[PDB]
Amino acid sequence: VSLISALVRAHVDSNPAMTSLDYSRFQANPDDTQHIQQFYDLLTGSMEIIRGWAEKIPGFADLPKADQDLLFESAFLELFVLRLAYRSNPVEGKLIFCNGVVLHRLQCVRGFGEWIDSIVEFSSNLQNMNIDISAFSCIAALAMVTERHGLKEPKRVEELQNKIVNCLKDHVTFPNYLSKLLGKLPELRTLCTQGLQRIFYLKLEDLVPPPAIIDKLFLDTLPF
Ligand SMILES: *C1=CC(=O)[C@H](C/C=C\CCCC(=O)O)[C@H]1/C=C/[C@@H](O)CCCCC
Numbered sequence: 001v002s003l004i005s006a007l008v009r010a011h012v013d014s015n016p017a018m019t020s021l022d023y024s025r026f027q028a029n030p031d032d033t034q035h036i037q038q039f040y041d042l043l044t045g046s047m048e049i050i051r052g053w054a055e056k057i058p059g060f061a062d063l064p065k066a067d068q069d070l071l072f073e074s075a076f077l078e079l080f081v082l083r084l085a086y087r088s089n090p091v092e093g094k095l096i097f098c099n100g101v102v103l104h105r106l107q108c109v110r111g112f113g114e115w116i117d118s119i120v121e122f123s124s125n126l127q128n129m130n131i132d133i134s135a136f137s138c139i140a141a142l143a144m145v146t147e148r149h150g151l152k153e154p155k156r157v158e159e160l161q162n163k164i165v166n167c168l169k170d171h172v173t174f175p176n177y178l179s180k181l182l183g184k185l186p187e188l189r190t191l192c193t194q195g196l197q198r199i200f201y202l203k204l205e206d207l208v209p210p211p212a213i214i215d216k217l218f219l220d221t222l223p224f
């Protein structure tokens with residue numbers, strides 16, 4: 001019932017099994033509407049799985065529904081990228097998605113554009129730090145459990161955030177490495193802007209219009 005245990009449990013229960021991965025579409029050197037649609041499908045498919053991870057963070061389910069939505073929606077792309085980066089094999093150009101589908105980076109270029117290159121690069125940096133499951137489960141939680149403008153119960157979010165911070169602190173001790181760990185969180189904000197830049201392009205291009213939920217989330221989150 002420990003907090004770090006519950007966070008690890010949240011992480012483990014919402015990630016695909018390495019023992020049952022889907023290589024049926026994988027192409028190391030591959031030879032467009034359906035690539036863009038794939039990109040959207042990967043985003044939408046990831047949404048329900050991350051929300052399900054969010055709900056397994058202690059205290060998260062206890063917030064007003066408005067606050068849950070605010071936290072989730074604000075951190076979604078940050079979460080998508082982090083979990084992808086941690087799961088994948090950047091040395092081999094392999095991206096492993098939340099449904100267990102394995103695709104080469106080259107297969108992701110048409111849909112994601114320049115963004116998978118940023119993702120794969122980030123995955124390289126993240127993995128070179130050799131962050132254990134416990135520590136990652138903390139960083140993942142902190143990407144979402146953070147103060148946002150428009151929270152009905154910010155002190156509750158603040159309280160939960162610091163509890164996760166101290167979990168990570170205690171686990172690290174089992175000081176230097178902690179700052180570089182928390183330093184991955186502003187780097188995700190940049191990666192999120194980049195996903196947004198990609199959706200922006202695609203929508204402007206208007207070859208495939210984004211599905212309703214992506215569209216709604218994209219439009220609402222723009223501060224202009
Ligand atoms: C990640 C980087 C961004 O550019 C946006 C930030 C936008 C507004 C600030 C929110 C913080 C607050 O509420 O105070 C975020 C991304 C948010 C996305 O996850 C929203 C979904 C995009 C549609 C797929």
Ligand SMILES: [Mg+2]
Nearest residue numbers: 219220222224
């Ligand atoms: Mg507008």
